[model samples]
Target: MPVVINSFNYDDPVNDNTIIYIRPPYYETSNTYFKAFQIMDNVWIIPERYRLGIDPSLFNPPVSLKAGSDGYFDPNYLSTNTEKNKYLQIMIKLFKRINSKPAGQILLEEIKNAIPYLGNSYTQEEQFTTNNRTVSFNVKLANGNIVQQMANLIIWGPGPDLTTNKTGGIIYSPYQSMEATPYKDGFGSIMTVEFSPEYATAFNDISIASHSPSLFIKDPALILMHELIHVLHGLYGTYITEYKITPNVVQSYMKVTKPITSAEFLTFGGRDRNIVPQSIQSQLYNKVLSDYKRIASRLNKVNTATALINIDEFKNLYEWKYQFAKDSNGVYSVDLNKFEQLYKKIYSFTEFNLAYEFKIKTRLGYLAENFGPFYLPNLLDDSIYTEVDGFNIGALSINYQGQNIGSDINSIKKLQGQGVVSRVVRLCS
Candidate 1:
């Protein structure tokens, strides 16, 4: 394989040793992510590596594995301070993969040369928010568009918000200023590469694999690489959602839940709503029935992830337990039965509307995104909506929540599923 240089196009790590605690960059068409491997300063992409599986170009010793979180890798494998440092360095390698068009090599070179090394002199503002001042940075967009932005960079561990703290890292550009900000806005914002506290702890720790107790934090550099992509060209979501139970899980626990939704629906899809006149109630019912199947699948995924996590790891993680699905009562509930609408209620209308046309929208889930490296696709899907007639349009479901670590079961499970073997190959020191 031809190794690339001075380009952001990096590797697609498909081995078992890769970290999956945080998310990766989201790019256009999202079908392809890379496995960036390097011998020295050389870096290259394994085209369609995610689609085609491990590339034949590198030497990957047989490492037994199974799925963990969104990607793959066992906690047993990534269970030390030394492993944390390597993951951070690997993250630096991942950022070196993106290459914007107009900004080209200069942008790639800047990120490549600076990366974790730029620890002191950058970030004219805080690590999570932008200065709101103009600072041009040429980059591309996720929609295949390119632009120059006023985004700066700041790297920190654990943001003040649920979404930021949940992911590996994220940028705060002015384009997503409030009103449920852009899960994709970065113009005039600060590129605050936020890290989780566990990861931060591992990152700051300077000890060999011995005496230091085991601390499991995914690589922060990968989070940094994921956020850096926003500066290049890509804006997936900057949603302002904390997390809420759909159809309200309490409604299910009481078995007072309606037949319209169930525990599976509540876990990944309860917040969805579809209204139609009594005439087309059956038709709407059929559409929602299909959506329920999807929710069931997602629920199964959640089950699988919980089953995979180490029981000790499950209870011992600092805030990682907070990443699991939480109920409206501020408690994280994994009991799938609690979400089940066991005593499904017959359909009835407590409220009335006149000349009301049926309004249907797809189940609302997290924002759309793709990884820059490590090569895992997003758990949530893009939402679909149908025309609606009403004075209060706010009664509609929108896919604005993005990904919530504390609330979104899919994101939590995805993190939990990232344990199967992929590339744990070394890129560089």
Candidate 2:
């Protein structure tokens, strides 16, 4: 997004404009030869990704695992048998637990599609030292139709997180929202749960050293439950701690009660081990039990098939894959399926925008790095200052970075740099 007002593709480093003389700005700097040029409008054109939908056929082309060491993805370490594999074992448990709940409807669908991508994590490609995994199953929908789907339950070992700085794990998010920050990537659908260095040390203790203690009780199972809740939140927008109620005015914290959250479970499972202190649990236990009625109320709402998929309740539904429930009798309802498809749509669009942004920005970046130190004010120091690309009769329009400056010569006068912009001429006779 740099200011691109120069000429292109001339080996002689000259362009098709003529220069005329102009004076210095009250300073003792050298003179400039300003060219008298006409202006034309609407020269530059940009893509319509944000304004329009992203076309996926054109969306590829830009390019972890613990993650962070060799043989982590060497295939020999990964297993197809759920009994021997921690990741697969837990995902099977997770597939069962989530399948039991009405809230699991959408997430269950995603797990079905992502199951194939799970176990192949080994030798497929990561760092820090780890295994990639996948799982699959046949699902019978409410309508009596059955279909098979796959889910990726990728596990990363002893990875790092700069935000929390240190933790047991993370279900990495690619593009959580269409807002600023993005990996151009991770959907809560196809999850990548990386273990912290601390978590991996504990893992080595239980699996390698044969140290079976209440403290080391298969943290993978517990954390998978936690990460599934993250996928739940990703698909259904449940378990989120915060949300905006008034759009830039009032922000509110959510009251989650039905299922224990990742943070809560981490504290619950680890408090006795000194991971979470004992003092905080004293009053929290009492409060946790007291919230059962509130929890049941939410459970009832989810189980009710007549209930609608309200956008106000789930913000992530604002994507392509969502539509009015064809199965439900009312227009208010939505088919809580295809969360993975939504993940696909959202990411393809993200990468599309990113690909072009990188292309344009890098082109300008390379030019500035090579030809720049063009200096501010140009100092009117060189005779190269001449034509106004912004005002050239032959040029269509002027786009400063991505903004429309104007179509008139007067507009080019307001430019921050003229020598950098208006200097295209093959020595006039």
Candidate 3:
């Protein structure tokens, strides 16, 4: 008997299956400075009262205690009797605010709006479940599935692991059970998404430091969308299955064989390894890029300086990762001069296109093409495999040409004639 696996659809809003849970940070009593926090879809805002508290009077000594250059209050000053009381009171209020409905609810609303928009023109009918209150970041699922706490916090460090470069959320797909009279398919009925508290805190800090909350708030939403796409991929078994030679495997093959030219890389190694089919991923990415442009356009309308600065910050972080990847002994570092030149190139684009192109070139393109270093060719067909040093090797040149446009067209027509034209459209379009 063929093994059957149960699965849930990410886009089914009616089933009310997908859930995003945001874990808040632990409150430390000794810390005097208020670390920024995000409420709803908004960036952390330092109240005018807090700004005043930073320096209450127009006197020389500055009546209020001073914060360090990094915007954190000195622990020694905060520990003082007078400062301690004030700091404690401020923190109590902050915690109360975070615990209240408004802090998580507004973010809940943003998430609701963002999820449905992830579906592209092609998958709109399958968009995220509609205005169902049951679907939210903070609320428990109506079906009694409780959100689980993460055992360890995800720290977003410098270099490739920056808040912008790293994924803050993840989906845990249902697993199969094996028992006598096995249910062939297990509770794969639900998918759970957890947002990292550390990533959230890092995002809050970076947005404040960059003075660009508008741009920052969108990151979580985008990350959530990306994970949802993975969820969709899971439902279809496209991303994790289907491809005989996965993209990473192909990339490894290329490196060992040493593809002589860039065109050779594009022809053989550059074919997208995504199981969702290229057309679907492309449409989804285009939708995301469009939404990004819309947000950037809105920011530009409100304040050109704010918009420009945020883009510059994005470029700086991206170049840091790009350069670090290019030359590094496994530690994150960037060439300042190279970054400046790349920053200039990125800055030349309009705000909307600038943001759109950055993602397209760096992220979407990688997801769509850009093979990596992992090796797993055994996953391919037996006919294509030949064992070498206990590894399955597929016909690299044949597979490369098969993925190319010249041969792909015939396969497209064959798929169309088979009455599953949508699959062909997804593959070749």
Candidate 4:
């Protein structure tokens, strides 16, 4: 096996704050990879889907057969209904195969395998309690009792390893765990990372097209590790709000001062377009920009409230609809003015710095176009800087560009010619 498991000790008794629950994707007989792709495509259409405890019902509807010029829906192109159904069914099975083991079990296995690599950097314990673990596999019922399921396996130890910090610092210790509580029973407060059956097939396509066959197999482990790092960061890092200049404006964005390193970037779908064969680099770079532009354009079209409602995972949980008044027909309708007020309240509580993800990709596109592809590698290279350190900030802060801007301030001014400040301002402000 590419992964391994080991035993360790749990220093304290388990509690809400001690156990991190993994809510596995539920098995649905009617669910298909086709449905999964449709849902994944529209997930951004409603941001709430990215939140914890997604309702399966939300994954329904708007099953489009319209194929893009790029043949996004070409699976239906097979000659016979049997062939088409077989392809879909096979894809679904592949998804289930990948997800057959509980998500927690998958995570535990990966964590153990990573220990040898991460152990020297962190504290390790000898024994851990893997048995008696509780996972949420039940649905709601009016009068039925909740069913508790035992995890397939468990291990104890220094818990899991934390990724290296932004400045290349490492600390070996157990994470300060917390319960997800309202979102999903027996889960953590962090976002629920899910992989539908279509994801495996989709990832395989990506790997084959990129000519990186290894990625086809490693994608799951990479994703698991990425999400795990995110959980660990949430558990240990301090959250802070930072002011960033947006297009013609100044706005606040959330950030973790203790940023993680880029060592796992390639593992988690990041590509250094510079070093790859030029033909592949160009193809990948253009594709990334096309994707970024589409998302940015869509996000720009909707008002903040509409976008929030479509994407607000907590809306149903919190009865956000109540803020809107009922129309003459008793349908609740949001007032743009009213929604603006509520938006601020919701924005105040957001934990993850979403804009940060947007800005990084936008900057990557900018760099690829303006500078040679070589500059792309330098940006992702953690030896010099981390993702939290904005590309423009890092580039202008140093004399790396050697454009003779006289000083750092002048360098920033010069970068404005490339619209770096404007782009950042536009994203946040």
User: Each model's TM-score, in the order given?
Assistant: 0.21, 0.22, 0.20, 0.22
Sort order, TM-score high to low: 2, 4, 1, 3
Report the lDDT of model 4 for residue 221: 26
lDDT of 2 by residue, 56-88 (tens): 332221213323321111122222332123332
What tens digits encode model 4's per-residue C-alpha lDDT throughout 207-326? Answer: 224443210111222223334443322221211112111122111322123322321222122232122245533443343334323322332232233111232332232123223443
Global CA lDDT computed for model 2: 0.24
Give the Cα error of residue 5 in candidate 4, in Å. Answer: 8.7
Question: Could you list the CA RMSD of all candidates, in the order they appear?
Answer: 25.1, 29.3, 28.7, 23.7
Lowest summed-lDDT stretch of 10 residues in model 3?
180-189
lDDT of the candidates, in the order given: 0.26, 0.24, 0.25, 0.24
lDDT of 3 by residue, 344-369 (tens): 32222221232232221112222222
Off by over 4 Å in 3: 1-188, 197-220, 233-244, 248-361, 364-429
10 residues in a row with least lDDT, candidate 1: 348-357
- The list of candidate 4 runs beyond 4 A from truth reads 1-192, 200-225, 231-429
Taking the candidates one at a time, how many backbone clashes does each contain? Answer: 54, 29, 3, 21
3 or 4, which is superior by lDDT? 3
> Candidate 2 regions off by >4 Å?
1-110, 113-155, 161-190, 196-219, 239-330, 334-429
**Candidate achieving the largest lDDT:** 1
